[PDB]
Structure formats: C-alpha cells, structure tokens
C-alpha cells in the first residue's frame, strides 16, 4: 500500500487540524456536509498508483472540508486556509522536497447524496514542478 503517505498526513492532521471530525477517506454515507467534518485523501489508493519505494515524495493531497449549507464562501475558504496550510506545511516530507507547498486548483463540491450542502475540495500536487 502507499501507506507511508497516510502516516505523514495523519501526523500533520493530528498536530494542526481543528480536530472536529476526521475521515481517512471520504465516507460512503450521506452528505457529510450536514455536519462540520474534514477528510484527507492522498492519491495512490484509487488505482494501483504504482508503489514507490523512492526517496522522493510525490502525491496529490486532496483535502475535503465539509460544512453546513448555511456556511458562506468566505468562512469555508477561511477554514481551508487556516487549518489546511499549517497541516500540509507540518508534513516533514513536504519540507524535504519543496521550499513551500505549491498550490493547485480549488474546487467546491458536494456530490454524494444531494449535494445542496457545502464542501471545499482543495487539491495540492507535490513535485508538480
């Protein structure tokens, strides 16, 4: 498994997140965004993802924060930056590979059950360039 990533991200999660509700991966339940929760998912489990025994760290860190529909964009956005950035920066591997974590696209979603709720999908690709 690519579980080395899981360990790194979980450690950072433990140290820097709000600590409200965490998901190892996005659950197969009804829209999470009914309640405030955060899930962290890194690429390599969806597919074989080619297991790497390499010294270099590369992964997509896809972090999803789920918040009530009554939560405005600025608050969702704030939640994302204020927690997620200190979390990712806390990952030692990111410090090893790159000077600072390089941004990738932000997408706003809600797409499991009905989707009228609020979730913020932030994607970070590491070793992107």
From Swiss-Prot:
Keyword terms of this UniProt record: Host cytoplasm, Late protein, Viral genome ejection through host cell envelope, Viral long flexible tail ejection system, Viral penetration into host cytoplasm, Viral release from host cell, Viral tail assembly, Viral tail protein, Virion, Virus entry into host cell
GO biological process, one term: symbiont genome ejection through host cell envelope, long flexible tail mechanism
Entry similarity comment: Belongs to the lambda-like tail terminator protein family.
Protein origin, superkingdom: Viruses
Gene Ontology CC annotation, any one: host cell cytoplasm
Cell compartments where the protein resides: Virion; Host cytoplasm
Function summary: Plays an essential role in tail assembly by capping the rapidly polymerizing tail once it has reached its requisite length and serving as the interaction surface for the completion protein.
Any Pfam family hit: Phage_tail_U
Name of this chain's protein: Tail tube terminator protein
Quaternary structure and partners: Homohexamer. May bind to major tail protein V, and /or tape measure protein.
